[PDB]
A paper describes a structure:
Human aromatic amino acid decarboxylase (AADC) is a pyridoxal 5′‐phosphate‐dependent enzyme responsible for the biosynthesis of dopamine and serotonin, essential neurotransmitters involved in motor and cognitive abilities. Mutations in its gene lead to AADC deficiency, a monogenic rare neurometabolic childhood parkinsonism characterized by severe motor and neurodevelopmental symptoms. Here, for the first time, we solved the crystal structure of human holoAADC in the internal aldimine (1.9 Å) and in the external aldimine (2.4 Å) of the substrate analog L‐Dopa methylester. By combining various high‐ and low‐resolution structural approaches, we determined that AADC is a mobile homodimer presenting asymmetric behavior among subunits, thus behaving as a conformational heterodimer.
Slight changes are observed in the orientation of loop3 residues Arg347' and Leu353' contributing in trans to the active site in the transition from internal to external aldimine. Besides these local changes, further small alterations far from the active site are observed by monitoring the root mean square deviation (RMSD) between native and DME‐bound AADC structures. The highest deviations are observed for loop3 (since it is solved only in the DME‐bound AADC). Slight changes are also visible in the backbone of residues 34–36 belonging to the α1‐loop‐α2 motif (NTD), in the stretch containing residues 434–436, immediately after helix α16 (417–430) and participating to sheet β10 (436–440) (CTD), as well as in the segment 135–139. This saline interaction could favor the assembly of the NTD and in the meanwhile it could properly orient the stretch of the residues 28–36 towards elements of the CTD (the nearby helix α16 close to sheet β10), in turn connected to the active site. Gln28 interacts with Asp32 which is engaged with Lys431 of the CTD, thus reinforcing the network of interactions between NTD and CTD. On the contrary, CL flexibility is minimally affected by PLP binding since it is similarly digested in both apo and holo conformations.
Author numbering:
A (entry chain A), B (entry chain A): 1 to 326, 342 to 480
The structure:
Amino acid sequence: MNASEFRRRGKEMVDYVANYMEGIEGRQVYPDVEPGYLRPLIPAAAPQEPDTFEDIINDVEKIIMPGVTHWHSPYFFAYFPTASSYPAMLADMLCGAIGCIGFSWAASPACTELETVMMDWLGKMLELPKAFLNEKAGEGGGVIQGSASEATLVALLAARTKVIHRLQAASPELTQAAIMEKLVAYSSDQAHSSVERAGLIGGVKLKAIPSDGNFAMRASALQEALERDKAAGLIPFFMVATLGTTTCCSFDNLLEVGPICNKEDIWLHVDAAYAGSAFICPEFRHLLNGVEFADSFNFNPHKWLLVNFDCSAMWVKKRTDLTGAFLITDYRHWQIPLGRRFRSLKMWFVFRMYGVKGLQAYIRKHVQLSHEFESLVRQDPRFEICVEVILGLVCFRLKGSNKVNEALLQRINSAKKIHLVPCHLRDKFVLRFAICSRTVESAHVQRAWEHIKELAADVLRAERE
Amino acid sequence: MNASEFRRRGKEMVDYVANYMEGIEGRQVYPDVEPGYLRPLIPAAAPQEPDTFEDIINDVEKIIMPGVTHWHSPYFFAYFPTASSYPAMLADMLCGAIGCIGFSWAASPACTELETVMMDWLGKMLELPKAFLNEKAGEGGGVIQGSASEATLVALLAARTKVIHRLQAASPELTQAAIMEKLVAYSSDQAHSSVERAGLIGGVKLKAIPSDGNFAMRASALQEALERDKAAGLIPFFMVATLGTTTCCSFDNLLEVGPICNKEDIWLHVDAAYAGSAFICPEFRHLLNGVEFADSFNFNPHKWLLVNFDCSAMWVKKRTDLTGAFLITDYRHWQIPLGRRFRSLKMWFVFRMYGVKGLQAYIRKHVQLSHEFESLVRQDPRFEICVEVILGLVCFRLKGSNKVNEALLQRINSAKKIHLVPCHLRDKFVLRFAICSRTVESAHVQRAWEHIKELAADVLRAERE
Ligand SMILES: *Cc1c(COP(=O)(O)O)cnc(C)c1O
Ligand SMILES: *Cc1c(COP(=O)(O)O)cnc(C)c1O
């Protein structure tokens, strides 16, 4: 394929993408296929001679789309939003066209320099402490990571290297392994599974801090764990505090946990993968208070800031600590892989084509829609809200047994009109309602609640009986 | 931005991308900017109100392009090729449009099922042993990784988990840490830096095996290292054998190293990140002989098989060993991150729009151009070829001191007409000539050699004098 043919097919793909987005409300949000549906529908071997673009696009509609879960359907209310905007799509096309692998400054200077400036743009939009920004010769700085899960692993590896060096400085005869079986990392009992995966990769123990009634990490529970583990010979070295937990969008108390981590010499990493995008709005910035005590901070523009995956933004106070784990000219020692693509183009395009006010309006509309769903639930005494509604998530359930709530969820996902997922809060089975699609409106939320209300009546009938 | 506006701007971006590719030979391949050039040229903060698409695209030409190293210029001869094809670009546009995060089967069934079938397509194109393919209920299988560096880390973590479990089964009182300071991994002295990074992340020792006269790992050097380290109390557990080393495109001997790794219970990972694409051609498949002894095999379609980054293909013999490190319905335990995008669409589009024969012709043209450059060097007795030319890489130098070769390289990269990078073979400073661009032709290679020949005369003058 040459560029002349790409001129034709590329514009045809633009129309196909726009057609799919304009009719996405006509798609069943969750598929009806079963595992293994795809292999019988395509050949067992690659074609020796080429297929036509018409044949391929037909297969996308006939064979791929039936097995697609439409994350950007307005009726997708599962997990958390993922980003989809046309400015990011346009930058992605340019990113693949330039096609550089910026493992070094020389590999493409703009690939590294634009990223550093965009991380300062974003840091200033969130009003981060100046110690996190790279501008003005500061020792801190920011990098794009592939994911928040990778960002958490990177912070743990930097913390592990730092504590090993400190411990061996105090005791030069101490081996890295003898240190290894004493290190312990901490996170909330509401922490994302990325923390457990990072502890396993890094080869250190991980313990969960019990959350309070609001599912937040507090000073008293942390001090109680430190007292026990330090007496047992464990060495606390790393902490993941979460702002906007995956379970119920709760918030660990940084003003309490921060000073404790500092005095204990515990590397404090803040996981705000979903909630972080809201901190560009002044009415939510107070939820970030205490980040000045953190050693690293991370959130996902590819969740709630319209920058298509992959784009996770991570800042650190000391870049030298980051480079220990394997003005800013190179990002090799900031990430797990060595290669990387021109991902900052997506941030640049999104920030410029929306503006700060356009992004703020997008956040506030989603939070407003969240409170609209919460208001509907609060009008039905058969239901209860389990956690305070702050951002684009509502955790609710039928009053009574978990069995009746497991049955309501099964009916919802069986009808395949809307899609949501549950969680477990202590021993309580809880349903989640997450505002996800960029194009979701009040009408979609209202229809979703009517569907939930109807199915709950059928479920409540079947259990009394 | 709505879909109607994307219809206009998306087609405008298609024309901009096609224009850039059609005029890429008019671009200076390596930039003249210095580190820090970008920040003074764009504002210090994001715009509050949106900018226009016209303003942004103008900034791409005025401000971004001067700091771009054009990897797809025909005169880019550095490192190794990276993939850029229009079928992959078209699939990338669709990938971002579907916009699913396939961390689970339910997150989008097609995102996982197409990947498994495409890895069987690719495995059959390389004529891998059936134990690596997923088709027909085999215990093996393949996954797309973000990079070969990440693929090497994943194999090391699986090997580490497996040997820890085996050692603790034989000695139940043995701690994971006591095992940790005895584990040792191996690689060639020509190994990519990804291996050293994986050893540091995994927390294990890494030793280099001395290469032979052809810079290949051999049985005798491996047996000598095993004899020394086993006597010292180290426990060999992981080996990275390289097919197509980054330094000189040498090949470790799998027929010798494979059986040794098997009998020593050493997990054998084969790193063929660049060379692997050539193994779809029958005349090169013999270079892969011995992969039947490997526990995991990896190569990069995003290097030499026209599938735009990111796309690294990894196969394993036992998926259960892979899932230990944190029919095929989930890929969470095959990779470092949890989230992932619909990357298999790029493989599907490239394989179908080119066909196996189209990809074979692309490989053979590059190798033919490599031998054309080698032939020119072999006509000049002032130069020498240091390693046998097999694929798209030629390692050459002026006969004499390293200083005269360091000077020739500095003149080449200072003239900014072509771009290449050097290596070190033992104590010898060596220049690399890599066939990279998809659109490179004989005329480009011939002009590059004339440039090198001219600058070598100037350099040889300045040193005798
Ligand atoms: C989504 C989420 C993650 C996962 O991040 P990815 O970028 O998908 O790896 C981690 N932590 C929290 C709190 C999240 O919401
Ligand atoms: C390029 C290369 C790598 C690097 O792989 P990435 O996908 O860039 O991480 C590793 N090993 C070899 C042999 C390579 O050629």
